Scaffold this active site. Structure first.
Site, PDB file in Angstrom:
ATOM      1  N   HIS C  43       0.040  -6.420   3.795  1.00  0.00           N
ATOM      2  CA  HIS C  43       0.156  -5.607   4.952  1.00  0.00           C
ATOM      3  C   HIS C  43      -1.861  -5.852   4.884  1.00  0.00           C
ATOM      4  O   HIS C  43      -2.367  -4.952   5.942  1.00  0.00           O
ATOM      5  CB  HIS C  43       0.291  -4.448   5.287  1.00  0.00           C
ATOM      6  N   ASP C  99       5.442  -7.739   0.029  1.00  0.00           N
ATOM      7  CA  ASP C  99       4.396  -7.187   0.391  1.00  0.00           C
ATOM      8  C   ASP C  99       3.720  -8.297  -0.227  1.00  0.00           C
ATOM      9  O   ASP C  99       2.491  -7.283  -1.119  1.00  0.00           O
ATOM     10  CB  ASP C  99       4.108  -6.220  -0.019  1.00  0.00           C
ATOM     11  N   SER C 198      -4.866  -0.509  -0.707  1.00  0.00           N
ATOM     12  CA  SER C 198      -3.878  -0.883  -0.586  1.00  0.00           C
ATOM     13  C   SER C 198      -4.504  -1.933  -1.566  1.00  0.00           C
ATOM     14  O   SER C 198      -5.470  -2.683  -0.656  1.00  0.00           O
ATOM     15  CB  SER C 198      -3.841  -1.580   0.945  1.00  0.00           C
TER      16      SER C 198
HETATM   17  N1  LIG Z   1       2.817   5.399   5.112  1.00  0.00           N
HETATM   18  C1  LIG Z   1       3.023   4.232   5.815  1.00  0.00           C
HETATM   19  C2  LIG Z   1       5.166   3.107   4.726  1.00  0.00           C
HETATM   20  C3  LIG Z   1       5.183   2.583   5.166  1.00  0.00           C
HETATM   21  C4  LIG Z   1       6.350   2.257   4.647  1.00  0.00           C
HETATM   22  C5  LIG Z   1       7.385   1.459   4.734  1.00  0.00           C
HETATM   23  C6  LIG Z   1       6.996   0.856   6.608  1.00  0.00           C
HETATM   24  C7  LIG Z   1       6.048   0.672   6.973  1.00  0.00           C
HETATM   25  C8  LIG Z   1       5.586   1.974   6.289  1.00  0.00           C
HETATM   26  C9  LIG Z   1       1.937   3.080   4.178  1.00  0.00           C
HETATM   27  O1  LIG Z   1       2.200   2.995   3.036  1.00  0.00           O
HETATM   28  N2  LIG Z   1       1.912   2.106   4.817  1.00  0.00           N
HETATM   29  C10 LIG Z   1       1.475   1.792   6.514  1.00  0.00           C
HETATM   30  C11 LIG Z   1       1.150   0.188   5.984  1.00  0.00           C
HETATM   31  C12 LIG Z   1       0.080   0.326   5.088  1.00  0.00           C
HETATM   32  C13 LIG Z   1       0.632   1.339   4.120  1.00  0.00           C
HETATM   33  C14 LIG Z   1       0.293   2.373   2.897  1.00  0.00           C
HETATM   34  O2  LIG Z   1      -0.587   2.922   3.880  1.00  0.00           O
HETATM   35  N3  LIG Z   1      -0.019   1.637   1.599  1.00  0.00           N
HETATM   36  C15 LIG Z   1      -1.417   3.012   1.281  1.00  0.00           C
HETATM   37  C16 LIG Z   1      -0.275   3.310   0.000  1.00  0.00           C
HETATM   38  C17 LIG Z   1       0.409   2.892  -0.692  1.00  0.00           C
HETATM   39  C18 LIG Z   1       1.055   3.515  -1.793  1.00  0.00           C
HETATM   40 CL1  LIG Z   1       1.273   2.785  -3.281  1.00  0.00          CL
HETATM   41  C19 LIG Z   1       0.493   5.292  -1.657  1.00  0.00           C
HETATM   42  C20 LIG Z   1       0.220   5.599  -0.421  1.00  0.00           C
HETATM   43  C21 LIG Z   1      -0.983   4.427   0.256  1.00  0.00           C
HETATM   44  C22 LIG Z   1      -1.659   5.220   1.680  1.00  0.00           C
HETATM   45  O3  LIG Z   1      -0.190   5.831   2.456  1.00  0.00           O
END
Ligand SMILES: N[C@H](CC1CCCCC1)C(=O)N1CCC[C@H]1C(=O)NCc1cc(Cl)ccc1CO
Ligand SMILES: *[C@@H]1O[C@H](CO)[C@@H](O)[C@H](O)[C@H]1NC(C)=O
Ligand code: NA
Ligand code: NA
Lengths: 28, 11, 250
Positions: C43, C99, C198
């Site tokens: 992602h 991912d 990420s």
């Molecule tokens: N909020 C959404 C849920 C998904 C849950 C799965 C379906 C899409 C939607 C999220 O996490 N996202 C959206 C895309 C990028 C990713 C992200 O941002 N990661 C960083 C991260 C990674 C971790 Cl391990 C913990 C927190 C975060 C920051 O949210």
């Protein structure tokens, strides 16, 4: 690599970082 | 924000 | 990283920053697995819901870094990308299943005190260490709280969570290609990845051979450091056959 996962400033010098012991203590 | 990186990496 | 601490110098020499060429900005974390290969979350490169679809020439990787924003002259090394490889079954539509992505560098990076690869787990190291309660370490330059940004690389140690608890914490469909980590509300302690972390590594130090292994990739969470929520990580070993196929073929 055959040398992977051994940090130059830590494992390669037999120096520990400040929190790696927390990880070891969890491996029960 | 971010310090500019050397232009060589952007060519 | 929420509720972490400043990294020590050289503490995570496999850390990689994914960097946008124009405008110049941090995109994601990543990790160095050899002199030519960098591992990240899919992602970070492809996420159509956010109009994200990067090509190689859009990106740089910055290796050996500690400061988030400084150009760390004589320490960090900046590499161009030869090719991006995204898992062919990466599920950006539903739940970020699989991912994972690889980036091949145009030229090999020179190792140093600040630049060194992490190991990828074998089946036995994964079976031994991927257990509820066992702690790993997450690193990144992402946000310090959900709702702000660090001067230097942040680090937090977090316990792996029992799979039923992970499943019961969310409405997202969890798969075997994911695990979750973080403290429970009753445990007192806190910490999580957040936006900008990420693609960075979840690492564990094997007590058998004293080497660091990358067990996870920072993948997704609902908020950051919320009580009763957990961060979700790509299960690196489960996808290692794909990693090996790519590296062997290219
Ligand atoms: N909020 C959404 C849920 C998904 C849950 C799965 C379906 C899409 C939607 C999220 O996490 N996202 C959206 C895309 C990028 C990713 C992200 O941002 N990661 C960083 C991260 C990674 C971790 Cl391990 C913990 C927190 C975060 C920051 O949210
Ligand atoms: C991503 O962009 C490439 C063009 O480089 C295109 O071929 C591909 O179909 C795109 N993927 C998605 C999911 O839009
Ligand atoms: Na659920
Ligand atoms: Na939490």
């Amino acid at each position: 690599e055959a040398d992977c996962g051994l940090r130059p400033l830590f494992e390669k010098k037999s120096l520990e970082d400040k929190t790696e012991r927390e990880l070891l203590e969890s491996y029960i | 924000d971010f310090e500019e990186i050397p232009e060589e990496y952007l060519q | 990283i929420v509720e972490g601490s400043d990294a020590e110098i050289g503490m995570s020499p496999w850390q990689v920053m994914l960097f946008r060429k124009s405008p110049q900005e941090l995109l994601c974390g990543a990790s160095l697995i050899s002199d030519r290969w960098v591992l990240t979350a899919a992602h970070c490169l492809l996420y159509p819901p956010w109009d994200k679809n990067f090509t190689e020439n859009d990106l740089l990787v910055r290796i050996g870094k500690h400061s988030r924003t400084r150009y760390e002259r004589n320490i960090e090394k900046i590499s161009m990308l030869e090719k991006i490889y995204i898992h062919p079954r990466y599920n950006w539509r539903e739940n970020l299943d699989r991912d994972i992505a690889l980036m091949k560098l145009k030229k090999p990076v020179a190792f140093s005190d600040y630049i060194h690869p992490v190991c990828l787990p074998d089946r036995e190291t994964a079976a031994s260490l991927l257990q509820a309660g066992y702690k790993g370490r997450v690193t990144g330059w992402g946000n310090l709280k959900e709702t702000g940004q660090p001067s230097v690389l942040q680090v937090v140690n977090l316990p792996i969570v029992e799979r039923p608890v992970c499943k019961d914490s969310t409405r997202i469909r969890i798969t075997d290609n994911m695990f979750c980590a973080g403290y429970k509300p009753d445990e007192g302690k806190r910490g999580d990845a957040c936006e900008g972390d990420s693609g960075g590594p979840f690492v564990m130090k094997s007590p058998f051979n004293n080497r660091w292994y990358q067990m996870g990739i920072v993948s997704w969470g609902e908020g950051c450091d919320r009580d009763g929520k957990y961060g979700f990580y790509t299960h690196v070993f489960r996808l290692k056959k794909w990693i090996q196929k790519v590296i062997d073929q290219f």
